[PDB]
């Protein structure tokens, strides 16, 4: 165990020990979106695909952008693990981040 | 309840615990339903369910030429496994509907 701290029986501050193991809608939607790849190699999941609405408005039946209706991102709070500095098996932290999964169409 | 031997085998991670509208206005509106599991973190997950099979026009009626569809997300949860100790957690991934969007069939 060189380079990486240690915890006491006490378990204070509180810790958990985690056992390690072993679609077209974005295009057809009235509030269409692009997916953008977010990568953080110290985060689990390392890779998160985040939505970004194509336009400020929504798309009518003739395929035009009308500004009476708004494209808005549907956001989700999700859990991630972050391996914090100094980057040890015991340096992890839980985090909750807000990510856009897609876009929906709303009356202002 | 097990023990953190120095060994750390089988491998674990130790995780430091922290000191801490659109659903109604959408053309594909949704209800939120409460999912609670008292051995999971987050214990409570709010899952979307689209109000109708169709979308809602500007006069507020349900027209069936356009479809309300659920947008899904794979998310991380911790499950506290038996025997239910601070050191008995396991990572898991579940698919949950976050909301609904409006699509041309």
């Amino acid at each position, epitope marked *: *165990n060189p380079g990486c701290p240690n915890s006491e029986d006490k378990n204070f501050p509180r810790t958990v020990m985690v056992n390690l193991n072993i679609s077209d809608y974005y295009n057809r939607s009235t509030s269409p979106w692009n997916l953008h790849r977010n990568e953080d190699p110290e985060r689990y999941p390392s890779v998160i695909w985040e939505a970004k609405c194509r336009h400020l408005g929504c798309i009518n039946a003739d395929g035009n952008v009308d500004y009476h209706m708004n494209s808005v991102p549907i956001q989700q709070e999700i859990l991630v693990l972050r391996r914090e500095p100094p980057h040890c098996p015991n340096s992890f932290r839980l985090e909750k981040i807000l990510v856009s999964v897609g876009c929906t169409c709303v009356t202002p | 309840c097990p023990n953190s031997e120095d060994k750390n085998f089988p491998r674990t991670v130790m995780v430091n615990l922290n000191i801490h509208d659109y659903y109604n206005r959408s053309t594909s509106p949704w209800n939120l339903h409460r999912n609670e599991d008292p051995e999971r973190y987050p214990s409570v997950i709010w899952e979307a369910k689209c109000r109708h099979l169709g979308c809602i026009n500007a006069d507020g009626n349900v027209d069936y030429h356009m479809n309300s569809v659920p947008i899904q997300q794979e998310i991380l949860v911790l499950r506290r496994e038996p025997p239910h100790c601070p050191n008995s957690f396991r990572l898991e991934k579940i698919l949950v509907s976050v909301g609904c969007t409006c699509v041309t069939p």
Partner: antibody
Amino acid sequence: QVKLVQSGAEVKKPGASVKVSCKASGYTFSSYWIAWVRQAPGQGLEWIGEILPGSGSTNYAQKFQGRATMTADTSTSTVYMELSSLRSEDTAVYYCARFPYYYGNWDVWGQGTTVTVSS
Amino acid sequence: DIQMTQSPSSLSASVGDRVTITCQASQDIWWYLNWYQQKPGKAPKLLIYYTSRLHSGVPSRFSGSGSGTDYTFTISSLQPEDIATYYCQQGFYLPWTFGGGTKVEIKL
């Protein structure tokens, strides 16, 4: 000063056995795992098994179970790998190496023992 | 078993070049990836442990990086003393498995 010293080169016929010794110094012998890894000619390392001298607990690669036996003697700070029913393909340099478990690395290695299995 | 794919199996490069070797595991190994060096006529030597940490005394021209299933080993400036075979090894779960090796040589 953490150090592992192995017995000398061996030449054996197919079907024979070989027993290689690994003498540890410079650390608390009972509390670290010692492993055996071999290098067959040309390229390639391969893990054989490991022993914790303190308890006598062992772990073997499935390929070698029943054919390789590891033992340890706390009174002499020595571990032994015995490999039976030797075949030509067992020709290799055999190493012992200490295996701190937290990261699962072999940090100190013996000098190697050349085992030639030839008819 | 966790299968380790190491590439390439061999290579040659000039003094002072940058060499990159890859190692890929068949499942997430949580940064438990070590790198060994075996110079001709010598015992293997631990160079890097836990993906990126340098064993005591190892030159800093050697480094490692990666996460999940995908790892790299890099020699920043190849020196003549660096002619050797390099191996990766996962230390995540039994049995301990190795990549197939990369034999490194010097072009003059």
